[PDB]
Symmetry: D2
Subunit: 274 residues, 4 copies
Amino acid sequence: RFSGKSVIITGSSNGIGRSAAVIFAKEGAQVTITGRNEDRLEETKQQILKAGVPAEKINAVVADVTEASGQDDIINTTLAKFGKIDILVNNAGANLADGTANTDQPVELYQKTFKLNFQAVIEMTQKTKEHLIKTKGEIVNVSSIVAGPQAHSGYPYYACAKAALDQYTRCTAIDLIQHGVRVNSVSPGAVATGFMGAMGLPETASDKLYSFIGSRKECIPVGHCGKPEEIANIIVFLADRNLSSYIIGQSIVADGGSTLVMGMQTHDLMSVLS
Amino acid sequence: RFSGKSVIITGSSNGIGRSAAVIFAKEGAQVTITGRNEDRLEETKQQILKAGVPAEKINAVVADVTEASGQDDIINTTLAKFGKIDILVNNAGANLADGTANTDQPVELYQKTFKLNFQAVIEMTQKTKEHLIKTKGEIVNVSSIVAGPQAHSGYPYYACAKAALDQYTRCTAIDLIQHGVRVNSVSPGAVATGFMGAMGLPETASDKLYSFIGSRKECIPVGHCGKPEEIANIIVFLADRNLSSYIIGQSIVADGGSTLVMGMQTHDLMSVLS
Amino acid sequence: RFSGKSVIITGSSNGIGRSAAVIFAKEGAQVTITGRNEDRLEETKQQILKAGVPAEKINAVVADVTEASGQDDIINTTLAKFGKIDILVNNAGANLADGTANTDQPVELYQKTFKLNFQAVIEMTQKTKEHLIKTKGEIVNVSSIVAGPQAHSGYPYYACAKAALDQYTRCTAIDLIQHGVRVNSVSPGAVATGFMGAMGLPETASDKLYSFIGSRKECIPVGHCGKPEEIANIIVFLADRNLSSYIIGQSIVADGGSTLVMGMQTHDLMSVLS
Amino acid sequence: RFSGKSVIITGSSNGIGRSAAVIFAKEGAQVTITGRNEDRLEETKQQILKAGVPAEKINAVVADVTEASGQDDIINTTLAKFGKIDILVNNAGANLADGTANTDQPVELYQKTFKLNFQAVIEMTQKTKEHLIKTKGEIVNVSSIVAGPQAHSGYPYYACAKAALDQYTRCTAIDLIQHGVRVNSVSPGAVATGFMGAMGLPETASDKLYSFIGSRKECIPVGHCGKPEEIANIIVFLADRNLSSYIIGQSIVADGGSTLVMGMQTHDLMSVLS
Ligand SMILES: NC(=O)C1=CN([C@@H]2O[C@H](COP(=O)(O)OP(=O)(O)OC[C@H]3O[C@@H](n4cnc5c(N)ncnc54)[C@H](OP(=O)(O)O)[C@@H]3O)[C@@H](O)[C@H]2O)C=CC1
Ligand SMILES: NC(=O)C1=CN([C@@H]2O[C@H](COP(=O)(O)OP(=O)(O)OC[C@H]3O[C@@H](n4cnc5c(N)ncnc54)[C@H](OP(=O)(O)O)[C@@H]3O)[C@@H](O)[C@H]2O)C=CC1
Ligand SMILES: NC(=O)C1=CN([C@@H]2O[C@H](COP(=O)(O)OP(=O)(O)OC[C@H]3O[C@@H](n4cnc5c(N)ncnc54)[C@H](OP(=O)(O)O)[C@@H]3O)[C@@H](O)[C@H]2O)C=CC1
Ligand SMILES: NC(=O)C1=CN([C@@H]2O[C@H](COP(=O)(O)OP(=O)(O)OC[C@H]3O[C@@H](n4cnc5c(N)ncnc54)[C@H](OP(=O)(O)O)[C@@H]3O)[C@@H](O)[C@H]2O)C=CC1
Ligand SMILES: CN1[C@@H]2CC[C@H]1CC(=O)C2
Ligand SMILES: CN1[C@@H]2CC[C@H]1CC(=O)C2
Ligand SMILES: CN1[C@@H]2CC[C@H]1CC(=O)C2
Ligand SMILES: CN1[C@@H]2CC[C@H]1CC(=O)C2
């Protein structure tokens, strides 16, 4: 339970952020849900309400997490309404696509990619710090296996932003634990959300993709494509001092086993000898 | 909840294994607790009973996990009494000490060390496999930060056994997930248990040690020495398909942040310039 | 030998870059040395000339690696004077300081730190590619143990920039190898150079700091503080396709063993028991 | 040069060891080559003689590295003929096969796999130490990408033995460096040698297998299967204190980029959408 806890979940107007928000709410938390898409943000709110959570325990904020005023709005409204902040979930993120790929992607794409997936995390962390230390709270960042240890050459900026995020999780974890706040992270593998849709893929195509990798053991050993709730459960676990108190500055990989398979292992000996 | 689940926790006559066993039991599991020390095994049983768990839901077995007959006894009695096996927790382990240290420790110490911390894990895994696949169960191994990434030159065999364990967790996870069983692990940092006592340290000395590292931020950033329950909570989380289903073949580090600190970082710039 | 090889070493006006430059030159390579400080760049040129290398083999360029103008001059002058580019070593880097520390360092320091330690690498890589694939050349990046696996909470942006670099090395390595160009990196530990001076420390304080860590085994196990040449040697090995041809997208750690020591290991058992 | 250097290369009767042996010899070192197969050991000696090296510089010893008798002969003959030992390269190793696979391989295969790939290293290290600290020598271990970070479920014991080796390299490196001896390692990926033959594959099948993976970029990004010399080169670099002096307790990965590819990346987006 997170009864009474004030929780801020960035990027909760869809996917992982949404699931996490409903879980926190079902666990008795006062949650600040936010995003840019007003319709989807409303959908998240309705799912929480449908869960039997009173409207006063929900603070929906329409904002761009990369904008200073948007960040301030998210934080100020949660403070005004809940009077404190216990947990910060830096979940908002995306693999920004402009049509280019590989090392040829423009630096402008690099700037925007880092602006969202990294700089915004720094800013939310800095602006939330003082409040988290007054409650001896938590921070849970949402990284990705795209950070490594394998190469993700098709989209280096997104991959490197996450890699930067991981070391930021470790740095802020060791610095902030001094003041009583724990910092950890989750590195998801493939998760069927609106992620590919945001990259430009029609629902029909994103579905085909998630379905394909979810059925190929060399893609996802576990036998199914990740679901938002599966990642949300681990974000919640890491946000629960009572259960994960001894875990500090770590990002637990949740990829159904994807990173445990090499490209060379997709061929079996026999078939190669034929 | 683990209502009805059949759980085998090796090394549950003390420390982490004990805590995990009581948690599983409190969660409604039928637990097989085992060890070599009859008195301590009984103490674990009593703690479970004191928790309000009926005696029929407890299978206490006195055995040496490195002995074939001991392993068989553990497995057979749990099958006879519970009729199935859902979770295997390879927790039994120890840093065997014979008075020597560093690369000079004898190979005989290496053989015994691996016999317990590694070979016994292989054997329990092989003998439990078929039953775990009939229930599409779980395996949770208990490794250690002594496996790396830092060197632990004072006791190379214990350190290397754990390192071997980690790759075994990954290997068996990818091989066994094909048949529906998930395999993960936990790599604890310092935990105040009977661990140092088993190495030859009197309770008074082990207490002084755990107390010292628990109060030095450069030793354990979190501000306290690990408690068995803190590691147990994560073993339980990993044993819960419903919550950690997408985590496969991973060992989550729980060391209060110890491995995040370098030896060179124990000196601050100013004091060095003085 | 690098006879018939055109090499560009950014940040070769001092420290590691300087050493790398003199070795490449001694091995018969046409070398382009660069930096912002003309006095020190001249000193580098001087050491190369003293090594018996003819002036027509050395192309000194004053430039700011973060400015497009500087980048273009570095590349164009080499192409104009040497007609091609075989090796590019992204050595330029620094832990920018503004007096602030920890998670409190301003985003402005972040932006400047990344522009130098990461964006400059992206840009030099993008602008040199074409010529490197022309000669089936090499790329050697210089990172730092500051990227991980330990936390470096005092200067997060410098740490995270290096963490991003490492994933960039991997991404470009896998992307550019299909065009015949190898990408690798070296992650140095502490090395007595002008690094600390650039941070604001007078030579006396710098020498003191370096001497101290070089004499404490819990700081640098190898027994001495690293010297520029020790890192230059491995940069040269990685730049020599004839010798390291099978190493791809890797960053070899050269820290005299620093990352192999935990902060907790700085205290021996007996000291604690008293 | 290794002029005035006495070098022991276990497993130098074939593959990587053979290549390493010829290079060391070409660099003017007194070399001790060893193996069990006298025919192949002779072939190694022959290549060294053909390289212009005098017979008094080469000490061929027939021995089983897993037997104390063999270990003592390897060491004593070198000391008797060359008077000292400067470098020890633990190259001997093999993925022992008995027809079984996966987590089902018997503990008996485990014991044999570890005795060769791990215990033999412990023993050679313990028995050579004294002489290595006498000359402030080097130790280079040969591991494998088989240790991780990916799973290698088909042959767990060989994989785990290498994982144990890596932590042993780190432990002994930090322990032996205080006595002036450097310990490092190289983790090769696929390399066309007699490795597959030892596993039971006829030369034709072996050549086919090696050619296949060397031509598929998702298998070996670099474009070719590794050759013994490519690994020997890095072993020699690590054995050359004059060049790698600052590298301690590290195992550089030389797999032509294999570990940088995920099984999921073997499928491109467009192929999936159709
Ligand atoms: N899906 C996958 O396979 C993986 C996802 N991840 C991580 O998960 C997160 C994304 O969620 P899913 O993963 O659920 O993605 P979508 O389901 O892609 O969710 C994106 C979320 O973040 C928000 N967001 C994106 N950019 C901005 C912005 N500039 N300002 C405010 N909000 C923004 C979206 O808001 P709305 O659209 O209004 O803007 C939305 O709530 C990222 O941190 C991502 O890296 C990591 C690994 C794999
Ligand atoms: N304590 C710490 O700081 C850390 C502990 N760990 C891991 O935790 C586990 C040990 O528990 P704690 O950690 O709680 O240790 P103790 O509290 O040391 O518990 C040891 C447990 O394992 C059992 N055990 C040991 N050897 C054998 C054997 N041959 N046959 C049967 N049972 C055996 C003991 O049985 P009884 O004594 O009868 O025999 C007991 O239940 C190991 O896996 C260890 O590596 C990992 C990192 C840190
Ligand atoms: N020293 C250490 O302990 C470690 C160093 N490293 C890496 O080594 C590199 C730094 O070299 P040393 O290590 O030799 O450092 P200094 O000896 O600090 O050398 C810095 C070098 O880079 C150049 N440089 C810095 N900023 C710029 C800029 N904006 N434009 C052009 N050139 C610039 C300097 O040129 P001049 O000042 O004219 O501009 C100089 O040649 C970095 O990549 C750093 O991260 C990694 C780990 C440890
Ligand atoms: N080939 C590959 O793709 C990879 C190889 N490696 C490592 O390379 C080494 C093997 O060499 P290649 O790689 O050249 O293999 P083979 O070409 O397989 O060479 C095996 C070598 O070790 C010796 N050897 C094996 N078992 C014993 C024993 N019991 N006693 C004495 N010598 C023994 C052989 O001697 P002879 O048979 O007389 O006994 C021979 O010189 C191992 O350490 C292996 O793990 C790591 C990764 C990949
Ligand atoms: C890197 N890439 C990200 C997350 C896993 C993988 C597949 C996908 O669909 C999006
Ligand atoms: C390696 N060593 C093990 C576990 C953490 C560290 C301290 C201790 O007391 C026992
Ligand atoms: C790697 N090395 C460490 C931390 C940053 C850099 C400079 C120094 O003096 C100590
Ligand atoms: C590293 N390399 C991989 C797996 C084991 C070894 C032999 C081979 O042919 C492929």
